[PDB]
């Protein structure tokens, strides 16, 4: 995607402070709580019946970390998100059968989690820059659906 250099250094600076394991676990857990039909893909994961059960489930936290890890690696290649995520795009279509609308919902939950975590440091221009990035990563992950 196309970020102005002051949007790129807003995204970069904020992300140096993110504990990927902790924010990942929170973003995937809040996805499964706020939009519970996304639990569809995870019934091998255990008890997902209350908010407290989802946020403390160890397989949600482990998977959350896996997901934000691969998202982190895409922040390093913001000039060609489609090439970075082509293999995972193909895997989420052909093998996991994940409706790409789920990537957009996680994108917006991750902006809520960053806002919750960083408070007044997550200013309206920094949010704007992270909304272009998570729309770009959603886009990249949907590209090889067929």
Partner 1 sequence: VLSPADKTNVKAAWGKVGAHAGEYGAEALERMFLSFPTTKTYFPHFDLSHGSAQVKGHGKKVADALTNAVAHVDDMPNALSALSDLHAHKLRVDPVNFKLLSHCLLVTLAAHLPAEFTPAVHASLDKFLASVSTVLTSKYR
- Which parts are annotated binding residues? 1-2, 63, 82, 92, 143
Choices 14-22, 75-83, 85-93, 117-125 (CB under 6 A): range interacting with ligand COH: 85-93
Binding flag, residue 48, ligand COH (CB under 6 A) = no
Residues at the annotated binding site for (2R)-2,3-bisphosphoglycerate?
Answer: 1-2, 82, 143
DSSP string, the chain: ----HHHHHHHHHHHTT--HHHHHHHHHHHHHHHSGGGGGG-TTS---SSHHHHHH-HHHHHHHHHHHHHHHHHHTTTT-HHHHHHHHHHHHHHTT---THHHHHHHHHHHHHHHHHHGGGS-HHHHHHHHHHHHHHHHHHHTT--
Binding flag, residue 66, ligand COH (CB under 6 A) = yes
Q: How many residues bind partner 1 (CB under 8 A)?
A: 39
List of residues contacting partner 1 (CB under 8 A): 29-30, 33-40, 51, 54-55, 93, 97-102, 105, 108, 111-113, 115-116, 118-120, 122, 124-125, 127-128, 131, 142, 145-146
């Amino acid at each position: 995607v196309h970020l102005t250099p002051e949007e790129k250094s807003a995204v970069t600076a904020l992300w140096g402070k993110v504990n990927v394991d902790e924010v990942g676990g929170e973003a995937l857990g809040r996805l499964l709580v706020v939009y519970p039909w996304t639990q569809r893909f995870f019934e091998s994961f255990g008890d997902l019946s209350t908010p407290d059960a989802v946020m403390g489930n160890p397989k949600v936290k482990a998977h959350g970390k896996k997901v934000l890890g691969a998202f982190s690696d895409g922040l390093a290649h913001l000039d060609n998100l489609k090439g970075t995520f082509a293999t995972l795009s193909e895997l989420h279509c052909d093998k996991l059968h994940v409706d790409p609308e789920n990537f957009r919902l996680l994108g917006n939950v991750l902006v809520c989690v960053l806002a919750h975590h960083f408070g007044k440091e997550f200013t309206p221009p920094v949010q704007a820059a992270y909304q272009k990035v998570v729309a770009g990563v959603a886009n990249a992950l949907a590209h090889k659906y067929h």
